[PDB]
Amino acid sequence: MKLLLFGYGNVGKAFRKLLHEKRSPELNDVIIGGIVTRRGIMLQDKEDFTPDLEGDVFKAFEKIKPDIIVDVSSANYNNGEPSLSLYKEAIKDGVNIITTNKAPLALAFNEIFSLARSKGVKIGFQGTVMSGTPSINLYRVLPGSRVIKIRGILNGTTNFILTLMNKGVSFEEALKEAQRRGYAEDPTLDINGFDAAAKITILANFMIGNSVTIKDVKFEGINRDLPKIKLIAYADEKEVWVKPLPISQDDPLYNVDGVENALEITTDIQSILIRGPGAGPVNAAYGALSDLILLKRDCL
Amino acid sequence: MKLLLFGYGNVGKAFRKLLHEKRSPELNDVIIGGIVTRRGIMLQDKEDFTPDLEGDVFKAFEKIKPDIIVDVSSANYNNGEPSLSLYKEAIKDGVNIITTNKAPLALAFNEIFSLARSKGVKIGFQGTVMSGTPSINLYRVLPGSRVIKIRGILNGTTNFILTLMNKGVSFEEALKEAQRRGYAEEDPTLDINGFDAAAKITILANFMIGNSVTIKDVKFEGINRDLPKNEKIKLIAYADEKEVWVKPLPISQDDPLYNVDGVENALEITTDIQSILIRGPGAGPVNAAYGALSDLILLKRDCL
Ligand code: NA
């Protein structure tokens, strides 16, 4: 089984490392046929990236003819490209996709998945939401029950800032500490709620079946005007949004502090919550590796 | 696909109802060929149990020749029987097993699963731990990661009582109320001794850690009116590579288990990649039945 690895920043590097740690017998026959970055194409599996040829991901794809594309490349939220068109091409060729790149799915989930379903091609995307903590894949083991609503904390930086504030720290001092720890840079991009909006978009599509794109989400982030508040991401059959809200002591999200993420899935039978880390390159890479193993099991 | 349902108390009845709700196209070809209880064998799928034949689970198995045995019978922790011998004979016949009965797995995990692996037979056992909240099945979507330790609240009855005790309710009334809701018998000794949590942590340690323990290896204690006041107490089950135990402990406010209240259960799984926690109802017949239904759908997908 031959992979094309698209992207070789921290996530791709972590992915290649996990793959070589021989973590499952299901991966014994898996090799990386090539790695492609903005610097070119390496037609070898090596720790260090050195391009053998110039060319983009489509050239790599045509040259290598992989069984699976693993997309760990940078999220382009302008238009999802080249990943969006690449996935459609791969699907039409019966090439499976494993991705940690949120953009194509936040922009065009139904387009991609409708096509995959029609061709019987599998898509792993666990690493797009809550990284290595089963979210997408948690729903895979909740068969036969309709999801009514989902609610979560889906961004660690804003959760960390709000955690400090509930403990009596001012917004200004809490933000500074997030910056000190490297969670926020202009911290504007890190605290605007967009990241959570991209994630809840994907969850909503997959779990509820609400064809939604990022433009449909009503989102906002955190700022000095906030007074225990959490940045809540929510989806149901009617709407998708992200907003700061007061959280009761009755709430299983109450204790979800620091950089931790959490997802509460409410079905006709029960409400369950999972919590874990939601970021980190090893974590995201592990979401992808998990999808790879499930794919080898024929369980996507 | 033909099922033999062993047991028909509240979980078996809920399971039958869930199946008849047509919740997945994966189950369209599934029928119940027979239901067996202490009262005999019903060779029909009926809401109400009326025996057609006298005889036990082995007779039912011989007659029906099911593709899958769904065991929702009561756990016999003395020796695991008849479920333990039934599973070994079923595995030898290439018959898959879905179970909510902890005893055979708490007593003979490695043997049962080794036999199953050698025959290519699948065992769903999600309903044995945390009912319908993915636990066993959560680990199924954590492939290629090494579990370092697990810690959780694994018994609904005792969590319900300890939650009430934390609110000024006497142990005696909390017990009385647990009894009233169908959580403890009129003699509640065996409902509160910590054994159920011990059997669950045994199964989790075997499956997730590869710690080949049986019930006899677990240090466990239960609850009673004598527990410390001024602290919120939870019955904590724990396993790592070295030890497995269950005991009532005072819980700190920053502990993720602090607010796991009522009949809610929770499991904290620490792996080489990450520490995660899952929480959901740990008691309720529909919930346990849904654990088994989830396994049945996963089986049909060939994902056990
Ligand atoms: Na206290």
From Swiss-Prot, chain A:
GO terms for molecular function: homoserine dehydrogenase activity; metal ion binding; NADP binding. Na(+) binds at V129, T133. Signal peptide: none annotated. Keywords: Amino-acid biosynthesis, Disulfide bond, Metal-binding, Methionine biosynthesis, NAD, NADP, Nucleotide-binding, Oxidoreductase, Sodium, Threonine biosynthesis. NADPH binds at Y8, V11, R38, S73, S74, T100, K102, G280. NADP(+) binds at Y8, N10, V11, R38, R39, S73, T100, K102, G182, E185, G280. Optimum pH is 9. InterPro entries: Asp/hSer_DH_NAD-bd, HDH_cat, HDH_CS, HDH_short, NAD(P)-bd_dom_sf. Its cofactor is a metal cation. Pathway: Amino-acid biosynthesis; L-methionine biosynthesis via de novo pathway; L-homoserine from L-aspartate: step 3/3; Amino-acid biosynthesis; L-threonine biosynthesis; L-threonine from L-aspartate: step 3/5. A sodium ion is seen in the structure; a metal ion may subtly affect the relative position of the nucleotide-binding region to influence enzyme activity, and could increase the stability of the enzyme. Inhibited by cysteine. L-homoserine binds at E185, D195. It catalyses: L-homoserine + NADP(+) = L-aspartate 4-semialdehyde + NADPH + H(+); L-homoserine + NAD(+) = L-aspartate 4-semialdehyde + NADH + H(+). The keyword Disulfide bond applies. Catalyzes the conversion of L-aspartate-beta-semialdehyde (L-Asa) to L-homoserine (L-Hse), the third step in the biosynthesis of threonine and methionine from aspartate. Homodimer. Belongs to the homoserine dehydrogenase family. This is Homoserine dehydrogenase. It comes from Sulfurisphaera tokodaii (strain DSM 16993 / JCM 10545 / NBRC 100140 / 7). The gene is hom.
